[PDB]
């Protein structure tokens, strides 16, 4: 997991939290296309960050930063 992946995830959460819900599905799949992760890691990314961002449980600097840092830790082994 390269340092740039974190920036990408962070940016994606910001977009999911501030963009019209209509495009959330496409915003999420796009990031998946960019990262090409195995399903198990995709699920961790969704459950810990993409889903919460889409449901409006983040949308906050602190909350977003914590989700990003936590998921990145899960993505690394």
Token pair, residue 41, equals 């890691």
With 0-12 / 13-18 / 19 or more C-beta atoms within 10 angstroms meaning exposed / middle / buried, residue 4 is exposed
Work out the number of other CB atoms within 10 angstroms of the CB of residue 2. 7
Please give the Cα distance from 54 to 3 (Å, whole number): 23
Is residue 58 within 8 A of residue 67, CB to CB? The reply is yes
Work out the number of other CB atoms within 10 angstroms of the CB of residue 44. 17
Which technique?
Answer: X-ray
User: Resolution to 1 decimal, in Å?
Assistant: 1.8
- H-helix segments, 19-76: 24-35, 39-45, 51-55, 61-75
Q: Does domain 1-77 have CATH number 3.40.50.2300?
A: no
Delimit the domains of the chain by residue range: 1-77
With 0-12 / 13-18 / 19 or more C-beta atoms within 10 angstroms meaning exposed / middle / buried, residue 32 is middle
């Amino acid at each position: 997991i390269r340092p740039y992946m974190k920036a990408l995830i962070y940016e994606t959460l910001v977009n999911l939290a501030n963009q019209d819900p209509e495009q959330h599905a496409t915003i999420r799949q796009n990031l998946y296309e960019q990262l090409d992760l195995p399903f198990d890691k995709q699920l961790a990314l969704y459950a810990g960050a993409l889903g919460p961002a889409s449901s409006g449980k983040l949308e906050n600097h602190e909350a977003i930063s914590n989700a990003v840092d936590s998921v990145v830790q899960l993505l690394e082994i």
